[PDB]
Amino acid sequence: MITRGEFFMIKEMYERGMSISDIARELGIDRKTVRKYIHSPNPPSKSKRKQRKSKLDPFKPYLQKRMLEDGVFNSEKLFFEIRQQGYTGGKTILKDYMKPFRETAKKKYTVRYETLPGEQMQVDWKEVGEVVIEGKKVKLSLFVATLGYSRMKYAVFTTSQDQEHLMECLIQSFKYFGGVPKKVLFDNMKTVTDGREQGVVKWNQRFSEFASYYGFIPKVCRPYRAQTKGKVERAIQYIMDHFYVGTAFESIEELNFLLHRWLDQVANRKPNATTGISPQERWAEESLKPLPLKDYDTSYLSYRKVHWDGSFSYKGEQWLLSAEYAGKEILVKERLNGDIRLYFRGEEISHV
Amino acid sequence: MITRGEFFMIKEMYERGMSISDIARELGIDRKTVRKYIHSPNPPSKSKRKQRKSKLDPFKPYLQKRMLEDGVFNSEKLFFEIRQQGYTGGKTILKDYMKPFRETAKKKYTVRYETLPGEQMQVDWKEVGEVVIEGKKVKLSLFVATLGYSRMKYAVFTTSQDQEHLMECLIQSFKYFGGVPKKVLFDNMKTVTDGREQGVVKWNQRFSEFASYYGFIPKVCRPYRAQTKGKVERAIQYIMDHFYVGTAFESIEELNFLLHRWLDQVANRKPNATTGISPQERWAEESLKPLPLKDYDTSYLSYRKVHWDGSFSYKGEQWLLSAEYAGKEILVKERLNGDIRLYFRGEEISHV
Amino acid sequence: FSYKGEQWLLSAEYAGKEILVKERLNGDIRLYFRGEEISHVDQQKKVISFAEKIKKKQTEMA
Ligand SMILES: [Mg+2]
Ligand SMILES: [Mg+2]
């Protein structure tokens, strides 16, 4: 088992012409050993041995059954049990054998990553809570979109977290940043996925079409791990401890106006604590893909029938449609702003 | 403002007979100052000055209103607001003024106390959960009583946390320890208190009578602070991670038998990690007050009426009472073990 | 904290921090924290349980 260096030295000194016996004398090795190593391929310094029997082998299946069906992980309890069965050794071997079965405590070290310019964006929601806006109880939610390289922040308040609202907020973010990223990171929302099909993710077909339309590649971090999108979560903490702490409002339009003004004043103006530069300069450094001229229409699409007289009803509303549109089927495109339009076989109805 | 030592030296050297001028020369003080201090009561080394005006005085009421009604504690937001009002200074003064109003983050240091022998005991409950025992869903609870000086542990399982069950478990603990403590520490349970009447505690009248009967003085730690009774909580963790982890059972009597055997085997036998001695030896060192001969009767007491024929019904049960006990009022003493006894004006009924 | 099977009680400032114990071959323990020197722990030949140390600190603070 002469080590790498010893074998190299033996072979080299032997090939140099030095006599073998005095080589052995110099290296303090037996002459037979040195001569055998002369005609050897490479330094031998490794011995392979397979596993061997231990004391806790007969009890091992029983302990495994205890762990995997009774959920017992108390080394003292298992030791006391098996001691009656016949075991006589200490607990160290038991702990060493049982350690792999124990759950892996979550780490505390946190890797840091710096995405390339115009290469990544992050999105998330924040359930603000229930408020009485204009005498109406609604569930307010905050949508936050954080750029990855410039740390920009766009935000907007909404009353619902429907796929339509998500897509519209993404449109607003893309317009705000003057382009679309090459990658957009969400969490595992059903408006973007439909579960992990054996490790792989199954994208919602409509959302996949939307992404292919705007060209941005979706990504999802992982189940029950929000660290991977720390930028946007920390931006949420920033906004909810700086803007929505004492600000008072009565209309969501007013709140959104105040939020945009606040962002453009301080949030996207104050230099970041890590990049140490105003986010707008980095934004100017960003290179996002151009937006399409026509935005992906995100509006509720329903089919309704006009009554005999010509009175058409949608939600708690009523219209008066010409007699030619009575008893037929029409399309009611409801934009998220409340602009309802009526269509009949492509044509647009001048609804009264 | 000559300090204590300087004044002492001046007075002493002057009274010794040393000339005053060379005293002043030696101590590097003016002759007038030294002479004035000669006839002085005590060393003058303190100057008292009252508060003075600052820059954030006019804004202080507004900031206080913001904090106390809008809940804003973001120094950046308040600074940005008041800067428009006219403030021109830095944020350090703002943070210093606003610090007292901020909530006091909980400490992490933990005082350690060692009660005197036979002087303190602690009690607590542990809601194990819901189990199907004998095809019946019951809410299992664990009652734990930990001695303070010997760290003994008594425990018992129960289906309810009623004042009657609490008192009976206390009786069992006192019998187990061979005596009653001089102090018993609970948490703020309504079976022992009725709320903090302006800081002071109002003891439940029945429980107060029970305590006065057994002579042990009750105590309650504080609202929302379980550290003060760490012994019993840690004993609960011990029992729920050592005994009730994999043990299987079908009857609560079996579970209690196993629990008592386990306690007397290991729990009250293994030396403690801090006292470093077997709890039973310290128990032998304990000096508890003697138990009363007759235990405080903890049994449901209800008054019922016997039907015309003589059929008396309690819960889903039926009896057959002699005709002389028909149409009258009787007492149904239900012991917690299920021993129902019938009483009629002190006499006991030989119910069939 | 702990040292060679004996548990010592420090003050509030030292809780949650790494101290350095230096023990001469003579047999005396000296606790150095953050370069400075902290109060001696009056090491005794007879081992005293953590409970007795808690009681002693309690009486001292009393
Ligand atoms: Mg989310
Ligand atoms: Mg409790």
DSSP letters along A179-200, please? SB-SEEEE-S-TTTEEEEETTE
Rounded Cα distance, A279 and A273, in Å: 11
The helix or strand, by DSSP H or E, that contains position A83, with its residue range, turns out to be helix A75-85
* B-chain residue closest to A262, CA distance: B77
Q: What are phi and psi of B200, to 5 degrees?
A: -85, 155
- The C-alpha of B42 sits at a distance from chain C's nearest C-alpha, in angstroms, of 33
Q: What are phi and psi of B140, to 5 degrees?
A: -80, 135
Q: Which two tokens stand for residue B198?
A: 């302006």
Q: What are phi and psi of A60, to 5 degrees?
A: -60, -45
CA B96 to chain centre: 35
Asked if residue C16 lies in contact with residue C25, where contact means CB atoms within 8 angstroms, the answer is no
Rounded Cα distance, B89 and B74, in Å: 17
Q: Which of B192, B185, B186, B188 is nearest to B223 (CA)?
A: B188
CA B94 to chain centre: 38
Q: Which two tokens stand for residue A33?
A: 């050993």
B window 156-215, beta carbon within 8 A of A: none
Q: Which of B183, B213, B179 is nearest to B285 (CA)?
A: B179
A166 CA distance to ligand 1 centroid (A)? 12
Provide the 3-class DSSP secondary structure of residue A304.
Answer: strand
DSSP state of A288: P
Rounded Cα distance, A63 and A51, in Å: 20
Rounded Cα distance, B116 and B286, in Å: 9
- The C-alpha of B113 sits at a distance from chain C's nearest C-alpha, in angstroms, of 6
Asked if residue A244 lies in contact with residue A129, where contact means CB atoms within 8 angstroms, the answer is no
Rounded Cα distance, A47 and A2, in Å: 12
Q: Which of B184, B173, B193 is nearest to B283 (CA)?
A: B173
CA A177 to chain centre: 22
Q: How big is the CA angle at A18 (ends A13 and A23), to the nearest 5 degrees?
A: 70
Torsion of CA A308, A314, A318, A321, to 10 degrees: -50
Q: Which of B215, B210, B148, B217 is nearest to B177 (CA)?
A: B148
Rounded Cα distance, B26 and A146, in Å: 73
Q: Which two tokens stand for residue A328?
A: 């037929």
A124 CA distance to ligand 1 centroid (A)? 5
Kindly give the residue spans of alpha helices, DSSP state H, lying in C1-62: 50-61
Residues in chain B: 352
A160 CA distance to ligand 2 centroid (A)? 41
Diameter of chain C by CA atoms? Answer: 35
Tell me whether chains A and C touch (3+ CB pairs under 8 A): no
Ligand in nearest proximity to the CA of B228: 2
Ligand in nearest proximity to the CA of B224: 2
Which of C12, C49, C52 is opposite residue B109, by nearest beta carbon? C12
Is B76–A245 a contact, with Cβ atoms under 8 angstroms apart? no
Name the amino acid, one letter, at A97.
Answer: Y
- The C-alpha of A242 sits at a distance from chain B's nearest C-alpha, in angstroms, of 6
Residue A116: burial class (beta carbons within 10 Å; 0-12, 13-18, 19+) = exposed
List Cα–Cα distances, A232 to A143, A153, A262, B21, in angstroms. Answer: 10, 8, 17, 77
**List of long-range contacts for B123-126, beta carbons under 8 Å, 24+ apart:** B123/B170, B123/B173, B123/B184, B123/B185, B123/B186, B123/B232, B124/B186, B124/B187, B124/B229, B124/B232, B124/B233, B124/B236, B125/B161, B125/B189, B126/B236, B126/B239, B126/B240
Q: Which two tokens stand for residue B207?
A: 């429980």
Is B245–A76 a contact, with Cβ atoms under 8 angstroms apart? no
Name the amino acid, one letter, at A146.
Answer: T
